[PDB]
Design a protein around this ligand. Structure first.
Ligand SMILES: Nc1nc2c(ncn2[C@@H]2O[C@H](COP(=O)(O)OP(=O)(O)CP(=O)(O)O)[C@@H](O)[C@H]2O)c(=O)[nH]1
Ligand SMILES: Nc1nc2c(ncn2[C@@H]2O[C@H](COP(=O)(O)OP(=O)(O)CP(=O)(O)O)[C@@H](O)[C@H]2O)c(=O)[nH]1
Ligand SMILES: [Mg+2]
Ligand SMILES: [Mg+2]
Lengths: 167, 177, 167, 177
């Protein structure tokens, strides 16, 4: 008897979700080869990619993108895996997301709250992230629902400055 | 005198491994399924004699983990095992031999002999997916190095206490000879 | 030309540190087989095990313990990998630490600040951790440097209650 | 017209891969070593003609990563590569063939032919660990499918600008025929 990659628990976790959130890349290869649905979504709209980016596993993040995972899926709060990586400052994962795609990476996608990833990175003051985003063309003008720009979301004067630098 | 025993609980997904442990240790059950992430643990304490008491380290291993590479690590220096299947899903019974191979592949008691294993036909409060007889299961066990077996139910507390005891005995018998 | 597992950067990171903090278990196997020092310590006293427990990689955590990693090494702040796992509520890693060892796991080791792991878990209110610790015999009496017990460090009444439950 | 090119930077640990990139992109250098964790990235923008401009995606790959399993993933759809060695550590030169094999093992330009590679003898501001001649290195390159090579220094900005240009040319020549 061999694996069933389409199995679900009652929060809609596939093996591939579990594999991702553990970090077991070899297990990912295997599940994908057995037909596992890469963009499978759990009860709150999270892809294996969302779980990897939350947890900060660059290796897995990339392997998922390699197997065609979509980076634009929005969870129940409107967050892409990029939004998650930004809220937890996994710069290594952010970068994977931004550079994998070859350009076809949108940095303008709003959350539930209207927040782009740059808004989030500014709020929690994650300089390295922030620079990465800006360097690949994140906008400083986009306003969220509260009509605050990412500028206004900055945690310090340090950060504000770094952002105006491109502005 | 007191003992600490590492005991494995293994078998396919959704079979009840976690639920068994949860009942046996906290007398709870939930119908809600949350798949185990890698490995879970629980501790059971037993007043066995008045002479003696046993700590039971229960190593709940997720059913997915036999397709990974970690089982060698998980199994190390285990002194006994439950292997578990869903009585209402025959797929899961075919799979117990793969776990049992994996196990014996990778752990012996210090004297080179395979550790005591006890088979668990779980969810017996439900309807048999397979009509295999107790008699056949008795045969199976003797043919594949299982010390024993029990119809169990995590839902309706059946035979868990008993199977635990049966296993611990076998273990104690190895650790006094 | 083959690997050199004893290489260091200027923060004292070995390959094995890097491998751990990424999650690459296969790479760990390989490095260890090539003579990598498992309890190697970085410039601030962190073992690969400390990095895995911080990052929350149960798989790696166990594999390191499997290769004989010591769980009692204290970093520059006096933290064991257990202390780290507790401050970031990786219950899955906590459990690995507590149950791997077979009993020879001390839960009384104080930090810099006198804090046992239980103090830490109480402060940040991580029920699952807390229960795990207590169930394997964490003390409620040990006081840190501020002479506060773990009881007094509790985040809520909820938590306090759970702790007194054993007391 | 504008382009986006994925370019790899590969080679043994402490060789200077990160430092090169850091200089070429931010005109900085540090003597302090921080080993790269898996993969790092940087973006370089070039005014090439006035007709044309090139975005350069630089994929800084940690030297350790050739003992892992991830390089197939990292290399995919790359259109050019730097391979780098420490001019003051011959060990690192022996190793460039292992990277080069790995590379060609795993990426071709769409027409089935191996991607343009440029070799980098880095830290030339230091003393030669090996006396190999430019002439020998010239031979080596022709024998192992390297388009070119340069003595470089991240410390003292030598030949990085030039090597970048040399590579980009080769790339552009493939992407207009
Ligand atoms: N009726 C009934 N249902 C049960 C019994 N045991 C478990 N279940 C149900 O089966 C499902 C799976 O139980 P669980 O313990 O999570 O299975 P598991 O072996 O741990 C699955 P995994 O190993 O992948 O984490 C749960 O919804 C549980 O309620 C039982 O004895 N009777
Ligand atoms: N003198 C001199 N030192 C250099 C030069 N390039 C790099 N170094 C030094 O070598 C060390 C390694 O450089 P770094 O770029 O971190 O190496 P790397 O290839 O990225 C090592 P890894 O790939 O494992 O992360 C650093 O301390 C750096 O200062 C150079 O051109 N000249
Ligand atoms: Mg389970
Ligand atoms: Mg580097």
């Amino acid at each position: 008897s061999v694996v069933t990659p389409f199995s679900r628990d009652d929060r809609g976790h596939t093996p591939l979700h579990v594999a991702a959130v553990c970090g077991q890349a070899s297990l990912i290869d295997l599940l994908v080869s057995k037909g596992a649905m890469v963009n499978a979504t759990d009860y709150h709209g999270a892809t294996p990619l969302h779980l990897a980016c939350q947890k900060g596993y660059q290796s897995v993040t990339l392997l998922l993108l390699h197997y065609k995972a979509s980076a634009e899926v929005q969870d129940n709060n409107g967050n892409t895996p990029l939004h998650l990586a930004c809220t937890y400052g996994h710069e290594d994962c952010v970068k994977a997301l931004v550079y994998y795609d070859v350009e076809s990476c949108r940095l303008d996608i709003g959350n539930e709250k209207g927040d782009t990833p740059l808004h989030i990175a500014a709020r929690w003051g994650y300089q390295g992230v922030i620079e990465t985003l800006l360097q690949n063309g994140a906008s400083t003008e986009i306003q969220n629902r509260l009509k605050e720009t990412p500028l206004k979301c900055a945690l310090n004067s340090k950060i504000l400055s770094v952002m105006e630098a491109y502005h | 005198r007191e003992h600490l025993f590492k005991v494995l609980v293994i078998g396919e997904l959704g079979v009840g491994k976690t639920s068994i442990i949860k009942r046996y240790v906290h007398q709870l059950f939930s119908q809600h399924y949350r798949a185990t992430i890698g490995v879970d643990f629980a501790l059971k304490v037993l007043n066995w004699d008045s002479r003696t008491l046993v700590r039971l380290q229960l190593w709940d291993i997720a059913g997915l983990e036999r397709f990974g590479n970690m089982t060698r690590v998980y199994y190390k220096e285990a002194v006994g095992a439950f292997v578990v299947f869903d009585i209402s899903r025959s797929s899961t019974f075919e799979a117990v031999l793969k776990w049992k191979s994996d196990l014996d592949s990778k752990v012996h008691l210090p004297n080179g002999s395979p550790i005591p294993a006890v088979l668990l036909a779980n969810k017996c409060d439900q309807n048999k997916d397979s009509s295999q007889s107790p008699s056949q299961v008795d045969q199976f066990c003797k043919e594949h190095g299982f010390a024993g077996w029990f119809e169990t139910s995590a839902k309706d507390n059946i035979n868990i206490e008993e199977a635990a005891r049966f296993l611990v005995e076998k273990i104690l018998v190895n650790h006094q000879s």
